[PDB]
Design a protein around this ligand. Structure first.
Ligand SMILES: [Cl-]
Lengths: 229, 228
């Protein structure tokens, strides 16, 4: 299938080029938050080592797609009244992402109150013949998604569903999931090359880096903080 | 005037910390468009940058109207027939001034060059703008300090020979700082920890470029790390 051949080509690409995935999500409402600029970042990253990119939003994805040759992991972020889930919560979101050219669809796979169950989101992804990525927050969530046959298990939500976000990335989750057979994408707070290397060392198949590459305001804050005395 | 700008900039550095962001994407990059350079400068200014460094007239004109912080302007050349690249001509000074630069930076190295350093500085002063000396050695920085140049950068240290050191030139920061220079540490300050070190070494401010505005460079650093 096109999905299996894409996975094979991505596995080859990670093996030959290194497992770097770049999330092209500027701060929303930022000067940088324009679809053409999102497109430019994605092209720049893909020219310089990114084996794939993550893109949020239909307008961004439609602008990016025609000018990008690597796989795109697509998400939609919503804010819901009754549920804390934001990442690709609806079947309609899956449909739109598929129609706009996502190669892989990522979605919140946490054990939290939500409008559509995980199995239904996954079925809808499979209906479009696309690969699925589970954005997880705990080992148990990751294992549960692995059991369903989901191709990519992300640590994306670890630290974003509990009481506080740790400073360091969740390397223990990477370690435990990868050694349980998951194809792990380490994601969340991998904001130095050393940390990204650390994820690979702990079993991650690839690492997604976001802020350190595509959020100028955040990078500036890091430096600004360092220089004040 | 120029003194009002320096005082304002002194205040902003004290209150926010001395971070200057150089907005220079890889030439030819998808990011290398004046509207994108302008967006990067605005983004940086909203998030801690007390000033930005912009290269090129097209970029500067596009950036200027939408930016409230000072702009350090340069024009980088390849074809002067000398090793000097940073703002080598009097007409470059004229064009940067006309385009809205607040501070003009220029190569202040003791190398062959079409225009002498005194003439460039005089040209900067004629436009009533502040000057910044991009220097490669302590001796170059002291010389420019004695001319009364407001900002002394370590910008060119490691960039005049075939070998570029991995670590930033922190010794040069200390030595110039001890000589009474208002030192702008510039060159290879690509981690927050290194920027902090420059301040501890006596830097007034640190200019960061690649780690903030060169996506291809940042990607390479991460790609090299994950590769194996
Ligand atoms: Cl030239």
């Amino acid at each position: 299938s096109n999905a299996m051949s894409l996975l094979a080509r991505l596995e080859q690409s990670v093996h030959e080029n290194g497992g770097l995935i770049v999330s092209c999500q500027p701060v929303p409402g930022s000067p940088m938050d324009k679809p053409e600029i999102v497109a430019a970042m994605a092209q720049a990253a893909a020219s310089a080592g990114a084996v794939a990119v993550r893109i949020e939003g239909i307008e961004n994805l439609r602008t990016v797609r025609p000018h990008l040759s690597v796989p795109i992991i697509g998400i939609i972020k919503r804010d819901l009244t009754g549920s804390p889930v934001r990442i690709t919560p609806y079947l309609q979101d899956v449909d739109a992402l598929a129609q706009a050219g996502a190669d892989i669809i990522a979605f919140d796979a946490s054990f939290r109150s939500r409008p559509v169950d995980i199995d239904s989101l996954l079925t809808r992804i499979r209906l479009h013949g696309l690969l699925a990525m589970a954005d997880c927050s705990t080992v148990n969530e990751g294992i549960s998604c692995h059991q369903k046959g989901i191709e990519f298990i992300g640590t994306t939500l670890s630290g974003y569903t509990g009481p506080i976000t740790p400073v360091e990335p969740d390397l223990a989750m990477v370690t435990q999931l990868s050694h349980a057979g998951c194809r792990v994408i380490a994601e969340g707070r991998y904001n130095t090359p050393a940390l990204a290397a650390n994820a690979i060392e702990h079993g991650a198949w690839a690492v997604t880096v976001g802020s350190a590459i595509t959020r100028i305001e955040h990078i500036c804050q890091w430096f600004s903080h360092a220089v004040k005395r």
